[PDB]
């Protein structure tokens, strides 16, 4: 007993046709977060 | 003849998504179509195997002599 599919995605374009958005997926989103807590103390300058 | 089939030729060879329900046809592919209109710009057809999946419009034509 069959039903209709519903795409996951929107139409990918086709080759040698004119340009379109289509299927192109979305640039990476902003870093946040990262060893904040102690970072100059581990950074801290040295000599002999 | 009443209720005919309506069948399409692949102009580019497509790939399925994991997961997308989507049919890899072959370019020259012969298959029949089972939903002309989905949504997103996507069909439904058969092929030879019998096996169905999602296919972009964009990708294949549609033949005449439909009815």
Redesign the interface.
Known sequence: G?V????????????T?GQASGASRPLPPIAQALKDHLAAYELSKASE | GSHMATKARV??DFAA?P???ELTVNEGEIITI??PD?????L?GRNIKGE???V????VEILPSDG
């Open positions: 069959t209709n599919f519903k795409p996951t995605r929107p139409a990918p374009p086709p080759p046709s | 102009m580019y998504e997961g997308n329900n089972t939903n989905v949504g997103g710009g996507w439904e169905r999946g999602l972009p419009t964009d990708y």
